[PDB]
């Protein structure tokens, strides 16, 4: 197996774009939503936990997520990338690039949680939580879905992380919750998220081929459709569109197309986008009957679930998708999508609860 | 014809960079120029019309612009990208990438108009206008210049859209007009525009070859030269440089080098940049004797015209350019540049007028 | 020698990312640190001197830095890129791309100085200074290290410019000095710097190969480690982390890994990051006993020195690096690193002093 330089180039740039989603994307997104007096602290927690995740990833995370192990985790053979030769190839790129690309997904996932909960959680408590939850939730679930584990070996479809990233983070954040002064800044973060998301979705093909291209176009289309879907629902329910509605719409479509983007046709991307924008609206509306920043987990959670379900529909050849695996009916894919979603919800929740409680028992959770 | 992965990678990244020009580039540019109390509304109109253009593009826009038809429009054979095989190649990249790249130019074009006029126009009126003007102006003109239509078949030179994007948008905006509180934000948008513009200009080569490289370097050089040209004129006329002058200079050179970048030598890029920065200054100065945000169409319009004229000069081999087509004197290229510019001005204006009047007759134009 | 399109693509995108570090990265970084009433002026000086450097680079800078000459400068054979054929290849990319990539390093270097000193220096004095110092300091030092000059011909290691960019700029700025109201904005600039830095460090390989990949990953790792190192020192010395501490940490690791990134293992990147974050903290702490914006040269200078020294340690094969050149002991590399650092400090200082004094004698240095 030889590395293709075009894929290497593509995937390093894609990694830079996913890192850009956290630093500064998600930080500016939450920075505009949360209370002014809490912005500096939130930006500090996002920056430090990001650093933390980068280090844990290289030390053991990548190895435990992508080494070969069992159905649930990999191994410790790649501690500090030990035994990965510089010229080792994975797919059609150098494995070092795979390490960085995958680590960038871990970072955005943690960013989604910390940016929202930063306001309410002690600093040392967030560090502890991030260590427990990245290690016992993000990593096994990344392993199950993308590392040849349980869900993969049953043919779950999740191109860029509807489960691993969004449902996973939404549940961890909502357990957290259970336990806007600057809209131009919200818009800027949304914009940075949108752009970085082309690396997230297209780079998820692992190569600059026709699947990256499909994912790119489906990203443009689902995002746009979700913006219109959300804005129309807002105009119908609230009388007029709003900037926050526009940005929330964009996030709803981005998140909804995430598991599907590399499997569906542009027709499907359009339908998924409209449904995700409306379901996102319905979702935050319901969450707002329990404020602001954690309602965002209503978008990530509901849109992730919807997107995951609808991947199992729109991948079908007859609906313009790339087609299910041989011998797989749409019914079977649906069942497998639902099982993947349930395992993620339950796995992430249990580990989140343990994470928050461990922190609470060591340093105390609620910021003093 | 087989896709080259290097070109695929390059052109997906270039597309992400052109999308970044609208979201958030042009939005932040206008956001800093217009009245504080109007910023949220403008950001909403830019976000929603952007979404709108993405959807119209995939549904019929691309097909009508790039399908084969007549001198003025393509066809409806590619409705929702029907009959484009996933692996279809166009040039040396997958056609799906061509769709996304071309659509991103439609988006920035509409962004230029909406960002300026958002303040003064009813929301539903802007949606109607965008539908009419994208469909009857952007698409035929894209078809005439880049889709093998009238102007192309006469050898018009316009590497990245001096006519299709800038003169086209300037005229539509100025008809609109006829019918700064945050300079750090203006600067940020200009900066985002500049960076995204490397994808706009370099990606316009369709491949990561020596023409992309020429376009890249000419972009650096024209922008810089226009900044100095504008700043010197300001120092001479107003006594000192200003930040807005600096940013306006950068836009003047970017817009002026747009039609020329892939055809000229760095010597020509320097000359075009100085002339565009000075003509831009002269232009806004004149427009300011008819405020702020629409004066920007003086830069887009005057610089686009200047850049289009000067492409027909500096493409010449003897002036360091790549050379005119065989059998084409500089005189002939000039005549063809001028004819292209006139057709664009007149075509865009007529359709803009119809667009605004249709809206005015349905929902009413002036924001209530 | 034929151009590889994958390398061409990679290196054009990398160039766009390094330009993004100056416009708007460093501008927003200083914009948040300096006095509110001085922001507009600083943004203007950064934008205009950036333009200035782009023009000088194409006119003679590139030629004098990368043409063949002597140990200290190149030649004037490439004036305005004369005699570089469009299809000329350098390494595995078109030489025009090499011109743009190298010019982008000149730009960020000047940005580091001007962004800090803008507050205190007359506009015309900064233009004069930039002309003298780019020409007699940046160019010879770029030539000595990367253009086959003195330091290169002794085997100095400096992957992406610990000397040419950071120590060089720190000294020029500190001579300048001798002669925060918006932390969200500081954070945004730091974030833009971090992301653009992947082009800076990875593109410094000149190709999308396994060395780019190593540089990418080492960038992620050193940055993150430096953030934790700085934050821990702050928590230990000041009682709690701060946002400015977080951002300063990130810059410390970025700057420290700059000379090393393509030569070291991830283990070394981690160690270099922790040491650079702590040394950066120690450094600004000492500089703050001589305010704010020039203390940043304590990060660039101290971290650059540390990173340069530690390249001569961690490149060793036994410490996971790519290995010293044949026949070179670690001791010898160390001596050569130290000599390179001394020459840079002394060369840049002497030329800075001449630059500032020439300006002072023509227009006067201190802003009126």
Curated annotation (Swiss-Prot), chains A, B, C:
It is a multi-pass membrane protein. The record marks 200 as: Important for optimum substrate conductance. Residues 31-41, 119-122, 237-242, 285-293 are cytoplasmic. Keywords: Ammonia transport, Cell inner membrane, Cell membrane, Membrane, Signal, Transmembrane, Transmembrane helix, Transport. SUPFAM superfamilies: Ammonium transporter (SSF111352). Changing residue 300 to E/F: Loss of transport activity with methylammonium as substrate. Shows normal GlnK-AmtB complex formation after ammonium shock. It is found in: Cell inner membrane. The record marks 166, 300 as: Twin-His motif. Important for optimum substrate conductance. In the presence of high extracellular ammonium concentrations, transport activity is inhibited by interaction with the regulatory protein GlnK. Ammonium transport through AmtB is required for GlnK sequestration. Formation of the GlnK-AmtB complex is influenced by intracellular pools of the effector molecules ATP, ADP, Mg(2+) and 2-oxoglutarate. The rapid drop in the 2-oxoglutarate pool upon ammonium influx and a simultaneous, but transient, change in the ATP/ADP ratio promotes AmtB-GlnK complex formation. InterPro entries: Ammonium/urea_transptr, Ammonium_transpt, Ammonium_transpt_CS, NH4_transpt_AmtB-like_dom. One of its GO terms (biological process) is carbon dioxide transport. The record marks 158 as: Important for the deprotonation of the ammonium cation. One of its GO terms (molecular function) is ammonium channel activity. The chain crosses the membrane at residues 9-30, 42-66, 96-118, 123-147, 162-177, 185-204, 212-236, 243-263, 266-284, 294-315, 331-359. Specifically binds 1-palmitoyl-2-oleoyl phosphatidylglycerol (POPG), which increases protein stability. POPG is an essential cofactor for transport activity and, in the absence of POPG, AmtB cannot complete the full translocation cycle. Can also bind phosphatidylethanolamine and cardiolipin-like molecules, leading to positive allosteric modulation. Involved in the uptake of ammonium/ammonia (NH(4)(+)/NH(3)). Transport is electrogenic. Following sequestration of NH(4)(+) at the periplasmic face, NH(4)(+) is deprotonated and neutral NH(3) is transported into the cytoplasm. Neutral NH(3) and charged H(+) are carried separately across the membrane on a unique two-lane pathway, before recombining to NH(4)(+) inside the cell. In vitro can also transport the larger analogs methylamine and methylammonium. Also acts as a sensor of the extracellular ammonium concentration. Belongs to the ammonia transporter channel (TC 1.A.11.2) family. This is Ammonium transporter AmtB. It comes from Escherichia coli (strain K12). The gene is amtB.
């Amino acid at each position: 197996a030889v590395a293709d330089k075009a894929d290497n180039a593509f995937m390093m740039i894609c990694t830079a774009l996913v890192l850009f989603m956290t630093i500064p994307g998600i930080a500016l997104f939450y920075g505009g939503l949360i209370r002014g007096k809490n912005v500096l602290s939130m930006l500090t927690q996002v920056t430090v936990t990001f650093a933390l995740v980068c280090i844990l990833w290289v030390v053991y995370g990548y190895s435990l997520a992508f080494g070969e192990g069992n159905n649930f985790f990999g191994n410790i053979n790649w501690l500090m990338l030990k035994n990965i030769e510089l010229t080792a190839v994975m797919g059609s790129i150098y494995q070092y690039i795979h390490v960085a690309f995958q680590g960038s997904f871990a970072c955005i996932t943690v960013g989604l949680i910390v940016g929202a909960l930063a306001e309410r959680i002690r600093f040392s408590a967030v560090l502890i939580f991030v260590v427990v939850w990245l290690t016992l939730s993000y990593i096994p679930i990344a392993h199950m879905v993308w590392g040849g584990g349980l869900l993969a070996s049953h043919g779950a479809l999740d191109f860029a992380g509807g489960t691993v990233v969004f449902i996973n983070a939404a549940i961890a954040g909502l357990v957290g919750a259970y336990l806007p002064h600057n809209l131009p800044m919200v818009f800027t973060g949304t914009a940075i998220l949108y752009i970085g998301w082309f690396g997230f979705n297209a780079g998820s093909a692992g190569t600059a081929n026709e699947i990256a291209a499909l994912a790119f176009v489906n990203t443009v289309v689902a995002t746009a459709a979700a913006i219109l879907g959300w804005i129309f629902g807002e105009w119908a329910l609230r009388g007029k569109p709003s900037l926050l509605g526009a940005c929330s719409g964009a996030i709803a479509g981005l998140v909804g197309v995430t598991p599907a983007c590399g499997y569906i046709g542009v027709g499907g991307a359009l339908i998924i986008g409209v449904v995700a924008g409306l379901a996102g609206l319905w979702g935050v509306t319901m969450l707002k009957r329990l404020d602001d920043p954690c309602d965002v987990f209503g978008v990530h959670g509901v849109c992730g679930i919807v997107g995951c379900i609808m991947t199992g529909i729109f991948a079908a050849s007859s609906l313009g998708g790339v087609g299910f695996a041989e011998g797989v009916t749409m019914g079977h894919q649906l069942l497998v999508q639902l099982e993947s979603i349930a395992i993620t919800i339950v796995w992430s929740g249990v580990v989140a609860f343990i994470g928050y409680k461990l922190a609470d028992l060591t340093v105390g959770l609620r910021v003093p």
